[PDB]
Homo-oligomer: A and B are copies of this chain.
């Protein structure tokens, strides 16, 4: 036996695996149970801490992926399959992973906790792009990722009930955060320096931990990559969650909350998944059926209310977006869009797309979107219309909620750093029109280009190394700038006055001002006044 692979955590002993990273070994502890399997009577219920075990628990393999819908849009295509589960689907999925340097850090090391995305309906901490071996090896970081319940299983709520209260997927995350406080020092991690980081629904989850007091004592810093707690898709009202749960219950033949939930618990997992998509109020894109609910418990008020009134004085936040946030969403529901053609659309297809892309918009509000995004010099140009459609979806759902979050946190005492990731991976198999799509920065931050077998360019390996340094410098100090590098250009904090952000690309840092300032003034200030007054 290897003493570097033997760890005693409060629940008992574990045996990890020595893994080979490009520059040397790492110790990986995969499939650690952090909760009692949320099966049977415990379906839809908050997680319970995992009971202690006997002997040495084998923590050398990733555990099951939470029950979720498997994407079959483009079957066998690397572009879609890379996001699809890579372990067996099971309701017994509440396990976490830990990567540490080999040997175990001599002094307490800053901890980075990854919370995956997938619209709160999908994802796993076991996907290749979330591999913590590089950050652990190269930057000496203790990296943790956990599985949390997604879909009906994690977010089906009958608000006010005790059996299905909602937000249980976020409670699974909170329990993995409590686990880290209690056990990370056994791995050489500093429980007093925990940075949460996530992308898309993961970033929204990070934001929801900022906005929920019981989570606030479990971390010190936060990274929100292409996602926010505020916005059109991250939350639903208690009413809308009640509507959706009652409809899915009807669809699966379930005729009192206790009675309804009891019946939902008798249904096989796949039956719930099979009907999940049928509860959305309109034909839409960037909208998910079971997402966090504004319950007045985990979320005391709507994220908008909480970000506008919160005190963020002793907080550091790294936020940002990718060049083309909304591009991939178009092939999943907008007529005229495909990965296999240049997707040059007509004006009619653009107006049609805006109603799907902004499903909550009135006729006047949709006209306001169309008139803002049209290039009145080339209003019929298919390339301009195709690119405008991507912008509507990315701006509405990601860029402008990020700009609003950065603005409110900065105004209310937080230390904020903002970025725009603009490098398209050389290895990308999605069409060129999709640009830098939502989620394709993750592989750089995690340092995948550093594996020569993955065939990224030399420039991409240097760029990934740079990104890993920003993220780990941020986790260490709350500032992404290298205290060693006495050379320019420094990454300035984002402020309400100067609105500074940086470009993350192959070229050195470039400081820009105003994150789509005019367009986001449209989404964040005008459009609410339009759906408000009428």
| A→B interface (CB under 8 Å) | 363-364, 367-368, 371, 374, 376-377, 499, 513-514, 517-518, 520-522, 525-526, 529-530, 533-534
Contact = CB atoms under 8 A, between A and B. Distances in A.
Q: Majority SS of interface residues in chain A?
A: helix
Contacts of A518: 376
Give the 9 A-B CB pairs with smallest separation, nearest first. Answer: A376-B517, A376-B521, A534-B534, A377-B514, A364-B533, A371-B526, A377-B517, A371-B525, A371-B521
A368 to B, nearest CB: 7
9 contacts: A363-B533, A364-B534, A367-B529, A371-B521, A371-B522, A376-B520, A376-B521, A377-B514, A533-B534
Nearest to A527: B371
A529 B369 CA distance: 13
Contacts of A530: 364
B376 A514 contact: yes
Nearest to A377: B514
A328 to B, nearest CB: 28
Given A377-B499, A499-B377, A364 B517 contact: no
A513 B534 CA distance: 35
A259 to B, nearest CB: 45
Contact of A374 (B374, B513, B521): B521
Nearest to A363: B533
A526 B513 CA distance: 28
B526 A367 contact: yes
Given A371-B526, A376-B518, 4 more contacts: A371-B521, A376-B520, A376-B521, A377-B514
A526 B367 CA distance: 8
A96 to B, nearest CB: 42
A188 to B, nearest CB: 45
B529 A364 contact: yes
Nearest to A514: B377
Most buried by B among A376, A514, A521, A530: A376
Nearest to A380: B497
